[PDB]
Design a protein around this ligand. Sequence first.
Ligand SMILES: CCCCCCCCOCCOCCOCCOCCO
Length: 371
Amino acid sequence: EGFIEGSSLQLLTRNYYFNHDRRSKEWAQGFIATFQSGYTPGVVGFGVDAYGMLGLKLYESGKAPDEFSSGGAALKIRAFDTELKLGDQFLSNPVVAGGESRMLPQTFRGVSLTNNSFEDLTLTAGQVSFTKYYNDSHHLSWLGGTWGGIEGFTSSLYAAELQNVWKQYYADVDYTYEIDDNWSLNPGAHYYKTVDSGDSLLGRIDNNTYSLHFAVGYRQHTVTAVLQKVNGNTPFDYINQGDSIFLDNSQQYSDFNGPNEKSWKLQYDYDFVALGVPGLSASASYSRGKLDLTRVDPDSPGYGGWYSADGKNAKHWERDLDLQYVVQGGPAKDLSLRLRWATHRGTGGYSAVDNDIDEYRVIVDYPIDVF
Ligand SMILES: CCCCCCCCOCCOCCOCCOCCO
């Protein structure tokens, strides 16, 4: 289509409300404007992507500082189903993301390469840097791919190096079987290997983390079983934590990722579609985990504070209630409201590591398509 003709600008308005009980509320506006050029015609095309981001409480982006802002752009070059972005850009993959848990995502400065030559295969590579954000600079490079070569099944393999911190490896599989027209099974696994790298700023790291999910769908109902296991004396670690889609036990509050923590969750989801009210969904979860805090090295530079002499039998749990309505028609079409309730308690001195809390979040989201 071409630079002008293929251009699009989106503005995302974000209302964000966060309530915390401890055994502090917060209100914030946010705006994210996104432009994408078309491509100059020819074998090798040229374009531009650019964004700007603002938020205001009603580096530390926002939720704990009265205002925040940022903007950037990247040059894109597209040849043979390969796209190269050079500049500031968003990222989501198993070893790197701006993260979905907070109001504004983090961005990254550098090179990304994405190949779509084969339908069913995505390859990506990259080298970027980023600062520090949410709750000097970092450098990270990754190589990865995602394969779709079978009808109900998907595969991923990724690696990253976070300079002087870690090398991280990740695999996954997801299978879906449709039995009846109303009954389906979704077995799946996530795997993370983590080792220390270079100067080893966080200290020694030898960490293997597993996520198991089994999901029975029946019509609108879906019930899901999760096992998660962290093997090593530091907790599973990743950039921009919370609500991770590469972990089956990542929850509103806790990631159930502590060192040597075994965990499970039972989740229930419902789609109100056939009950007459489409765009309405709800879900509830219960998660339980246990780990032995005596096994942490208290002198571990990055992770030392997980150690507790009195930890031993430490355990915690979380029960999440989640519902969201997207408005599907009229003027507010696409306006989405989402309500989030989490309760978390630990026992066995888990509280020397994390807190007993009750979290309430409300998120109002309005997309605008401007050209
Ligand atoms: C399945 C998508 C292709 C992934 C590109 C390579 C990602 C980098 O991984 C480095 C670590 O991999 C360890 C051994 O890799 C075996 C490579 O061949 C496997 C073929 O799927």
